[PDB]
Every structure is written in structure tokens, then in C-alpha cells.
RNA sequence: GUAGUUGGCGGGUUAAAGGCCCGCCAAGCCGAAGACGGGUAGGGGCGGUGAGAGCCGCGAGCCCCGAGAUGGGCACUGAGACAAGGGCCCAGGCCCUACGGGGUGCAGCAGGCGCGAAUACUCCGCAAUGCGGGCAACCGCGACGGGGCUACCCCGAGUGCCGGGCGAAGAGCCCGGCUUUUGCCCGGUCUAAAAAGCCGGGAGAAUAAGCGGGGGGCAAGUCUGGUGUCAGCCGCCGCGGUAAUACCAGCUCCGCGAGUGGUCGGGGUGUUUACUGGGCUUAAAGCGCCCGUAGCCGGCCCGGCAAGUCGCUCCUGAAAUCCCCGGGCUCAACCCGGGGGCCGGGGGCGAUACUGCCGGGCUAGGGGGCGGGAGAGGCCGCCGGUACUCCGGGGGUAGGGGCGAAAUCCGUUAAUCCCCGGAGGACCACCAGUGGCGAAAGCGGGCGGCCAGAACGCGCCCGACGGUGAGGGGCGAAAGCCGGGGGAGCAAAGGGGAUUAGAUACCCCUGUAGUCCCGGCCGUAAACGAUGCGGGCUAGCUGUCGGUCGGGCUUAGGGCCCGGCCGGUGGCGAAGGGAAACCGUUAAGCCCGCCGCCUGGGGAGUACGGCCGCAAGGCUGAAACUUAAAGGAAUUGGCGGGGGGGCACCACAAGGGGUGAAGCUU
RNA sequence: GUGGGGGGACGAGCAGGGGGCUCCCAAGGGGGGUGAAGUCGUAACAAGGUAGCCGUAGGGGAACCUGCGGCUGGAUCACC
């Protein structure tokens, strides 16, 4: 039984990137998936994102730019604080200048850089590098 | 170590097999893992010059299958100990 | 064969219970929790004990080695148990006499069990009548 | 088994010939470190 | 499990609420989210260890709370005790006595005995810090303060410096010079007084280094003597049995040093407890299979809340301890001053992405359907196929049967073989397949009836109804057990004939349970894919099975061929994975859930307890002790009463001469 | 202020059973296991000389043998 669409979509993207495909189709989807893809595209890891209106909830076709070295959804969705962002940073990312964590906050889903800029915390979602 | 991917018998997706009795034997195994070698068989071979086309003498031939366990199949030379590379070769067992 | 097991965000107590269940597979944890050392050890958890020497004995070294390691039989004062204690050092047995009070001490070796080629000896003599056998052997002291 | 016995205890120690040894006093830590520096770092 | 137990009502008592206690009334209360029972333990601040998560309690000493004063009870006074140096009683000790009586229990500060591996002076002062009393001055205080003893923890130093010679560049000795920390003596200061400390003065190189080790790990000797698998070393690996770098000694070197070692316990070690972060095909490890309770985990969209979550703020989380900063002791250790933390509780104000709750709406997962097919799926009934055994009769003599060889055995009351009839029990040959069905066990003749479960096709219905599942269940080969029926063939046990040194086996003849059916029990298996169940993603090529769609043909058939999808079932094999064998869209890959199991070997699937069983037994399941490996996959060889090939008068075949017997030489 | 009898709550102690959890002691066993190699065979490893192993039942100086079903971890990855 399908449980987490976010982890499903992220691992599908990782499998397509490992196979060196140009585009990955993501079904089922939700707004969390859309905002995560938006953050990835903003940081350049994911290319163009096309919506498809099939009757069964919608699909996302994502273009891959050869930029991902490893992707994945942090599960469980740990509540993290602004002072606690840095240890999760070192836990999931290589190098202090490489990669980003994705966080869901009360002002919306953003990267760990934007969360540290806003001086907020939230729920960890995924990592990219 | 697991010799063969077959388990030594091409049994198929089932739990138990009907199983048969060995000839010259009775150790035997199920329907798979047994040898079923077939021979042409006819009574009184090459008398067809002195019979058949003499008198009226109409003879009959009867294809006959013999079932052997692994021990007898090795014993009468119907099975050899092939090398590891040749273990996966598909050859017929001399009819 | 997939996904540890209780990984949920509200599976903390279940994960703790599951991890606590499998600590009893560890011999060290079970021994420490059940107090087997303080039940079955002749020393009863002490680093050393006292005893009275009863007879002098010689154990045979293990198969590849050829030797008669010389020990004594010591009866512990606090429990009364009689145990074989190795007497180390060349000529160390000659400083030991029957009915002599001795200080019995763990022989070393892996996990407090027997040493290298001596079979089934867990203790050794450190003191004889209040004077250390090392000092007696080295001549720094004389046995009283 | 072995040809050892309890009657043979201390045999080699009692049998070795006694050679008197020279008196010796060890160094203090500063002098020892001086000696090691002199003999190892130097010639 | 509980029976004043849980609650209610009315009272008593109390300083005060309360089953605190009492009278009546009801059956309630706790429990697998683990009652009850047992075990261990005073709780906290805190401490050790690790880079950290974490683990441990050395959770002894210091501070806060608790309890106790030989065990068990009960009271007086008083604001306060059911009172450690106050009282009364029982118990159990002990001391004094003039025998009538009295006192006493150090878990107060010293001190003694005892126990144990294991331990301080029967010292000095109320000067500091405080307290009780007093208007006060003052008084008292084994609190507290001070020293003593003690390898208690941390800090700073000495056991000489300089040059020369001999020595080896070393140690050490000698020579010439310098210094006095330190040790010793004196004064001041200090001290409640002392001691010590500090200042100053005197002689003086003068007073001061050990512990462990040198075969690898692991820094340091293949130098010398002794011993000779003895004595001894040895955490592990390993030395020693004549030439020992490993033992005993000398010399010499190494490590740390006022310390250095031995044994224990904790942490590291250890990704061997795995949240970070392990593994379960074969190394230990998937329950034999399935149903499902709690729990954990759960589709999409919209609206409300703001519980989790996040931000800020406040009241807090005693002090000491810990981290940072400044300052003061000669620096230091340490003390003083400021900030932080001390992982938490609560209040206020905010945010709404995610989780949760509430409401409405969906169809993607799930369930229920309709249609044509597929299937050894099941239960029940009826029927057949040959084979077989036996029986009756007819033919025809004398053998048959068995084996490597036989023999037991069957046969002259006619056997084996052939024919004509009857009876009985099992099985369902070929077709037939890594073919099908089923959760597993398992299911193979035909027809019929009654059921079940899937796949395929679908603009059918409901609208998340789902996953997994501790505990709890139900099904579950063979053998076996209980009772009844049946019994052809086979056949444990048993009998006999052989073989062998033996043969209580392997071969032959025979033979009973059993195998079959009915009802029940058993509940195990190499119950295996040694591979838990659910879902998603990730090259392909190829055989086959079911359905379906497109084209072609047509044994005009429910048929055949090619191509696509869906769903099974095999083979090879991308990426990836693995110790490797190997897995590889039927994963052992990349992920998301939940359950079960593993933590070196032996002891040991043992002992005890419990439960289950008619019994056999089954399930669950240790420790003591012992051990340094047990183990997996693969490589080379060696070997084989496995296979294949080649060769040889130190092999054979075809031959010739011989030796082995006599006498003699050797 | 008292001295008798009785009732009441608390409640030691001594008499006793009841149970449990512990711990020792015992003539004798009872299955076991470690040594060092002593006897008897040769059960496993090679188609280990009767292929092996699993459960079960019977039998036997003993390793073990036999019956039934199962597995290959077989010495067969292979009919026509
Ligand atoms: Mg099976
Ligand atoms: Mg050992
Ligand atoms: Mg009241
Ligand atoms: Mg009560
Ligand atoms: Mg570490
Ligand atoms: Mg104290
Ligand atoms: Mg008392
Ligand atoms: Mg009192
Ligand atoms: Mg006392
Ligand atoms: Mg005292
Ligand atoms: Mg005062
Ligand atoms: Mg020091
Ligand atoms: Mg010189
Ligand atoms: Mg003075
Ligand atoms: Mg030394
Ligand atoms: Mg030496
Ligand atoms: Mg070295
Ligand atoms: Mg050594
Ligand atoms: Mg491991
Ligand atoms: Mg295994
Ligand atoms: Mg299974
Ligand atoms: Mg089991
Ligand atoms: Mg099993
Ligand atoms: Mg909130
Ligand atoms: Mg401070
Ligand atoms: Mg605190
Ligand atoms: Mg504090
Ligand atoms: Mg289930
Ligand atoms: Mg269960
Ligand atoms: Mg049966
Ligand atoms: Mg019969
Ligand atoms: Mg028979
Ligand atoms: Mg298994
Ligand atoms: Mg593995
Ligand atoms: Mg493969
Ligand atoms: Mg078990
Ligand atoms: Mg039992
Ligand atoms: Mg080879
Ligand atoms: Mg010849
Ligand atoms: Mg001759
Ligand atoms: Mg054998
Ligand atoms: Mg055999
Ligand atoms: Mg038998
Ligand atoms: Mg027989
Ligand atoms: Zn056979």
C-alpha cells in the first residue's frame, strides 16, 4: 500500500537520475510534492516541471539536469528548530557549501538556507546534493 | 554450497509431486528428477532377411520408455559427471 | 528483509521496548543484570580473597606444551570453598607450606577464566602470610 | 605425560650460577631526557 | 488481581479534605498501553567514559529532600516529637549491687573488638562561619574551625649548573669554577596558640629515583653465561625436547617517573545492541501457513481549529558543578565578579507548511459486481481402465522362483505357462511440460451435483472502507496414538536361507502392525525458494500458461500464426548489490511500513518451572563449567573401490630364458 | 486521687497451623560432559565402498539398521 508520495517521488527521481534519463513522470502527487519540486528547481537540481491533468489527481513531469548526486526524503518528518538546523545539515549533507535540506515551515516549504535566513524552524522533508 | 539453480529437479510452481517408482530400483524420486530414456525396441532384430519377407511373418516394433533414478542413470552410463561449464548445456540423452 | 521495523515518528516507545528485548541476547548484559558473578564466583566479586593452603598440587600443561605447573589447594575463609590457585615464579611453590594463610587473586587471562596453557585454573597466589610472594621471590622480604 | 614433578620446583633458579651485579642508581627524569637527547638527537 | 476492595449517602475524628474510621446502600475498581507477583534500589543536583549519539552509577565523600536510632509498639510535655546523648512495654543482650534494687545499646567526636582484600588522633579552639540565651557585655557548642595520620584528587618544584679529561657520543669518576631551590640551624612576620607558608640571615654540593619491560602486537639485544619440552615464561599469538632474541642471571638498552606496576568494575574498544547505525539464501538468525485485537503505519482536494510543530517573550528549572570572559593568589592548581547552559514545566502573543481533530467533495488503493473463458481447487455420489492377488473349471508335464552363485520357498492333491469365469484392494500408466490450481500442507481416470478462490474485459456499484500485526486463534506431510471397518500389493518388528572374522545389516524367501476408509488425538518435517507480508521505481532478449485486442490464415472449430496489454510460470542477462557462490521487474537493487528472529563455540533443544497431550511426546527454554575458535564462499594440491584420454617388456598380450625345490659360493 | 468487673481502638510477644520462595544435608542413582589414548567395530567425509540428511516408529554391544513420507545441502541443472 502506498504511504508517502514524497518519498515515492524522490526515490523515483533518484532512480531516473541513476539511469540517466531526461525526464521522470511522478504519479500520485500533492501540493507538498509540488513545493518540493519548486524548491529543487529554484536551486537548479530539477529542471522544468509540467503538470498533467489526468483524472486521477494529476501528474508531474520533471526534467533532470544531471545535477543530482543523491536525493531522498528524510523520514520520519522530524520537527527541527532554527538552532537545531545545523546538526541536521552536517548529518545529511556533504561539505558546508554543497547541498540543501528542504524544510516545511509555517511560512511554507523552503530550503534550509532560507529557513536560517528567516530564523525559523519546522519539519525536515528531504535532502539534495 | 547450492549446486544447481534447479534444486536438482525441474518441478515447477507446486508443493508436492505424484512421484514414480524406479526400474531395477525403487530408491527413485518424483516425476521430475527421474530419467525417462526411450528406446525403439523390437523382438528379434535383423532377422528381417530370414523372416518378414519370408513366410508372411509380420513383426511389430514398440517404442519403450525406461524410468531410472539418479543412481541407475549414472550406473548404466545414461548420465555422466559433466564439468561446471558444461552442466548447463542442453543435450538430449541419446534418444 | 526491508525497513528495520518500528520507524514511525510515534513509534518511540515501541522501538525502545524492541531494543530492550534483544539486549538479553548479550551474555555480558544478562550476566551484569542477573548478578551471576556475585552468585557463582568463589571470590564473590572481590578483587582478592584470603585462604588457607591445604595441599600442594601439580597440573599438567595443555597438549602442545609439556610442563607441570605447580599450584596449591586453598580454602577461602569467607566462603569455605576449596579452589586450585596457581603459584607463579620459578621456585615459588617452595615458599608455600600447608596451613599457610595466602592471598588468592585472579590469574588474569581472557574474561577472568583460565590462563594460556594451564587448564582450569582461575587464581594465583599474591601473598603468603601477609608478605608478597613477589617480594619473597626477589629477596626484598622474608616469609614470616 | 610430562616428566615434570613438584619435587623439581625451583630447579633452574637454584642451579644457575650466582654472578654478582654492580650497584646502580637510575636517573631522574630531567637527566634521563638529557641523556636521550644527547645520544639520539646528537651524535 | 481486589472484597473496605471501588463508589454513593449519613456520621465520628482531625488543625484540616479524604474508606482516615464508622452505619447503611450498590457492584464496583485494576489489568496484556502488562495488573498482580517476584527481584533490585533511598530520589535529585550530579559523576566516569566516548569526537558524538550513547553507556555506566565509582547515585561513596559535597548540597537538597526522605527514613532510622538494637527489633517491634505506645504515649507525656510542648507552637512543634510519638523525641539519637528524654519516657513506658514486649523481645533480645550487657554492666553495677550490700540481692532488696539500679542502669545501659556510639548508625555524634575520638577510641576498642569483630568482619573483611581493604582504613585516621581516646589531639587544639570557640579566633573565623553560625546558632541557642542575654538589653547588653558576654557564655556555650566533638557544629564549625586547626593541625595529626594516611601513595585521597589536582598544582608547582628538587634530587644540581658550567668547562676539561678519562669513558663510548652513555652511566659513573676525577679536576676547576658557580648556585642554594631543597634539606638542616636562627630572627621577624604569620597562627586563637602552634605547625606550615612568606621576608631575611649561616655552612654546604653538599640531604634526596624508582617501577615496569626488550620474540610480534609494542619502544627497547640474535650480546654473554646456566638449564635442556625439566625448571619457567605466556592478557592473545606463542617459546623451552642442545647450539633459547621469549625461561634463570650478567651486561646493556626502552617506557613513564615521585611514581610505576597486579587484579577487579565502568566507558572506549564495538557498526559485537546498530535512533544516528548492523544482520536473517548458504556464515547465528523468516514462526509450517493463514485470520485478526491493541499498537504502529496510512490516498487526493477544499474550508474551520491551532492540539503536535515553529518564532518571540515572561515566570521558572536552589547553590555548587559544567562552557566562555575579566580579575586576584609568584604563574599554576584554586578563589572572586559577569554571560551561557544545566535538553524540562507552565503563561502570553504570533505562524499554518506538515501531523491531528471537525465538515464537505473525490477516485488513484480496497471491497462488491456483470460477461466469456481457465484450472489435478474442494466435498459428495455413480461409473470405468488395465495391472494384480486369490478362487473354480479346462489344456499340459515337472519343474518353477530367486541369485553374482545359490539355498530357503512353491510344485506331482496338475505347479510355473495357456484358456474360460468369479471375487477383492490399491492406483489412474502414455498424453504429461522448471504445465496448472491452492495460503501452506497438498491436488492427476470419467460423468453429475454442491461450493470456493483467482486472472482477464468493463464510462457497473461504495468512496480510503487500507498495511502489518505482539497477545489470541484456525488449518497443518509422514510416522504414531484411541475406537470401528477393510486388507490385493508392499512391509517396521519377527522367522528362515545366504555372505562375512563377526552380520543382531546390505542379498533372497516369508511375515505382523502399518499403509486404505470413518470419527477423534497428535501438531512435528531439509513443513525449503533454507528467501515474512504490503506498495512504488529501475535495460532488455527468449520458452510456456489464461484472458483480451489488431492483422493473416483457416481441418470453417472452443482452430493456427504474427503483434500489443494485463496477469502467472522458467532461462540468460543492463544498472545495482554481494565474502563469494550468485540475485538481478518472480531482487538478494533503489525506497516507504509493520511483524518475527540473531549477537563466537561446547555445554544444549539439555536441566528446572509452566502449559498442552490417552500416550509417545510437544511448546517454551537456562545457568554452572569449559573452550580460541566453531563457521561461510572460493583457490592450489592430494586422494577416490567417480568419469575420460595417453603411455610403458623397471606393464600386459605373443614368445624365449629362467628364479622358487637339491649340493655348493655369497 | 483512687482500687476492682466489663467493654473499645492500637498493639507487641509467645503459642500454633497455611502457603510460598530461598538455602543447605543426605545412603544411593541418572542422564551428561571433559581428558589421554586403552579395548571393539568402522557410522560420516570419495557414487566413503549399502549416496547423504530431516521427522517419526520399531530393533540392535555400540557406532547404527530397517519401514514410511520429505529434501538435495546428489553422483542428474540434459528424453523422444
Ligand atoms: Mg514439501
Ligand atoms: Mg585459552
Ligand atoms: Mg468532615
Ligand atoms: Mg482503606
Ligand atoms: Mg569511538
Ligand atoms: Mg563523613
Ligand atoms: Mg523500636
Ligand atoms: Mg527514643
Ligand atoms: Mg549501635
Ligand atoms: Mg565513631
Ligand atoms: Mg566564636
Ligand atoms: Mg606532580
Ligand atoms: Mg671520550
Ligand atoms: Mg613559625
Ligand atoms: Mg628494573
Ligand atoms: Mg634478559
Ligand atoms: Mg620493536
Ligand atoms: Mg616477553
Ligand atoms: Mg553483526
Ligand atoms: Mg544457517
Ligand atoms: Mg516460510
Ligand atoms: Mg519455532
Ligand atoms: Mg520447523
Ligand atoms: Mg500549538
Ligand atoms: Mg562563577
Ligand atoms: Mg539543574
Ligand atoms: Mg544551577
Ligand atoms: Mg493480517
Ligand atoms: Mg502470533
Ligand atoms: Mg498416517
Ligand atoms: Mg496381512
Ligand atoms: Mg513379501
Ligand atoms: Mg526457515
Ligand atoms: Mg548475506
Ligand atoms: Mg540471473
Ligand atoms: Mg526452542
Ligand atoms: Mg519439562
Ligand atoms: Mg582438483
Ligand atoms: Mg606374457
Ligand atoms: Mg636353490
Ligand atoms: Mg563407512
Ligand atoms: Mg554409505
Ligand atoms: Mg533391524
Ligand atoms: Mg526383513
Ligand atoms: Zn534406481
Short mmCIF file of N, CA, C and O in Angstrom, two decimals, chain D residues 19-42:
data_model
loop_
_atom_site.label_atom_id
_atom_site.label_comp_id
_atom_site.label_asym_id
_atom_site.label_seq_id
_atom_site.Cartn_x
_atom_site.Cartn_y
_atom_site.Cartn_z
N UNK D 19 76.18 -14.69 39.75
CA UNK D 19 77.14 -13.70 39.29
C UNK D 19 76.78 -12.38 39.97
O UNK D 19 75.68 -11.86 39.76
N UNK D 20 77.65 -11.83 40.82
CA UNK D 20 77.34 -10.56 41.48
C UNK D 20 77.18 -9.42 40.49
O UNK D 20 77.89 -9.33 39.49
N UNK D 21 76.22 -8.54 40.78
CA UNK D 21 75.86 -7.45 39.90
C UNK D 21 76.33 -6.12 40.47
O UNK D 21 76.36 -5.92 41.69
N UNK D 22 76.70 -5.21 39.58
CA UNK D 22 77.16 -3.91 40.00
C UNK D 22 76.01 -3.10 40.61
O UNK D 22 74.86 -3.22 40.18
N UNK D 23 76.29 -2.29 41.62
CA UNK D 23 75.29 -1.33 42.09
C UNK D 23 75.00 -0.30 41.02
O UNK D 23 75.86 0.04 40.21
N UNK D 24 73.76 0.19 41.01
CA UNK D 24 73.37 1.16 40.01
C UNK D 24 72.23 2.01 40.55
O UNK D 24 71.34 1.49 41.22
N UNK D 25 72.28 3.30 40.26
CA UNK D 25 71.24 4.24 40.64
C UNK D 25 70.70 4.87 39.36
O UNK D 25 71.46 5.41 38.56
N UNK D 26 69.38 4.78 39.17
CA UNK D 26 68.78 5.29 37.96
C UNK D 26 68.80 6.81 37.95
O UNK D 26 69.07 7.47 38.96
N UNK D 27 68.50 7.38 36.79
CA UNK D 27 68.49 8.82 36.62
C UNK D 27 67.14 9.40 37.02
O UNK D 27 66.13 8.71 37.08
N UNK D 28 67.15 10.69 37.34
CA UNK D 28 65.93 11.44 37.46
C UNK D 28 65.39 11.74 36.06
O UNK D 28 66.09 11.54 35.07
N UNK D 29 64.11 12.14 35.96
CA UNK D 29 63.51 12.36 34.63
C UNK D 29 64.22 13.40 33.77
O UNK D 29 64.38 13.19 32.56
N UNK D 30 64.68 14.49 34.37
CA UNK D 30 65.37 15.53 33.62
C UNK D 30 66.69 15.02 33.06
O UNK D 30 67.01 15.22 31.88
N UNK D 31 67.46 14.32 33.89
CA UNK D 31 68.73 13.78 33.43
C UNK D 31 68.54 12.67 32.41
O UNK D 31 69.34 12.54 31.48
N UNK D 32 67.48 11.87 32.55
CA UNK D 32 67.21 10.84 31.56
C UNK D 32 66.85 11.44 30.21
O UNK D 32 67.31 10.97 29.17
N UNK D 33 66.03 12.49 30.21
CA UNK D 33 65.69 13.15 28.96
C UNK D 33 66.92 13.82 28.36
O UNK D 33 67.08 13.84 27.13
N UNK D 34 67.80 14.36 29.21
CA UNK D 34 69.06 14.93 28.73
C UNK D 34 69.91 13.87 28.05
O UNK D 34 70.48 14.09 26.97
N UNK D 35 70.02 12.70 28.68
CA UNK D 35 70.83 11.61 28.13
C UNK D 35 70.26 11.12 26.80
O UNK D 35 71.01 10.88 25.85
N UNK D 36 68.94 10.98 26.72
CA UNK D 36 68.32 10.51 25.49
C UNK D 36 68.48 11.52 24.36
O UNK D 36 68.74 11.14 23.22
N UNK D 37 68.32 12.81 24.67
CA UNK D 37 68.57 13.83 23.66
C UNK D 37 70.02 13.84 23.22
O UNK D 37 70.32 14.04 22.03
N UNK D 38 70.95 13.64 24.16
CA UNK D 38 72.36 13.65 23.81
C UNK D 38 72.73 12.46 22.93
O UNK D 38 73.53 12.60 22.00
N UNK D 39 72.16 11.29 23.20
CA UNK D 39 72.57 10.09 22.50
C UNK D 39 71.80 9.83 21.22
O UNK D 39 72.33 9.17 20.32
N UNK D 40 70.58 10.34 21.10
CA UNK D 40 69.75 10.07 19.94
C UNK D 40 69.71 11.23 18.96
O UNK D 40 69.98 11.05 17.77
N UNK D 41 69.37 12.43 19.42
CA UNK D 41 69.36 13.58 18.53
C UNK D 41 70.77 13.98 18.14
O UNK D 41 71.05 14.26 16.97
N UNK D 42 71.68 14.01 19.11
CA UNK D 42 73.07 14.33 18.84
C UNK D 42 73.80 13.07 18.37
O UNK D 42 73.19 12.05 18.05
#
